[PDB]
């Protein structure tokens, strides 16, 4: 799938080590979903680690067209479903296995460099 991004619309404070506090108006990076109820969003601004945030506390959008999926109803299991299905977003389990196997020793490419923007 493509590097989709989600934006928090409500302040969701973490509860356990498997949860990450978020605020309304923040930028999070989606990694996977869970039964179309929970979404795996990570911090983009600050630096800490991946957590867990419900779809009812986030808004699926696109860095290319954030105004396209800005009207969508994440709450509606139907809408969120078509989105996750269309974009072909991986699930939590799939994400865990992917990262686990990806971290292991295998073929890869050293070439490649990425960085974060910075203005004002």
């Amino acid at each position: 799938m493509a590097p989709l991004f989600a934006v928090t619309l409500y302040e969701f404070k973490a509860e356990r080590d498997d949860e990450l506090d978020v605020s309304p108006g923040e930028n999070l990076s989606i990694c996977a979903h869970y039964d179309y109820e929970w979404f795996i969003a990570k911090p983009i601004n600050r630096l800490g680690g991946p957590g867990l945030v419900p779809v009812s506390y986030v808004r699926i959008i696109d860095l290319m067209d954030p105004a396209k999926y800005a009207s969508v109803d994440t709450y509606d299991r139907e809408q969120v479903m078509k989105i996750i299905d269309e974009f072909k977003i991986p699930t939590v389990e799939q994400w865990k296995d992917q990262t686990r196997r990806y971290k292991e020793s295998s073929i890869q490419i050293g070439n490649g460099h990425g960085q974060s923007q910075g203005l004002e």
Partner: peptide, 16 residues
């Protein structure tokens, strides 16, 4: 994985 959200799915701010 440590990412098993077995918790319930919360609803949006509305009068159900």
């Amino acid at each position: 994985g440590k990412f098993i959200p077995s918790r319930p799915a919360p609803k949006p701010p509305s009068s159900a």
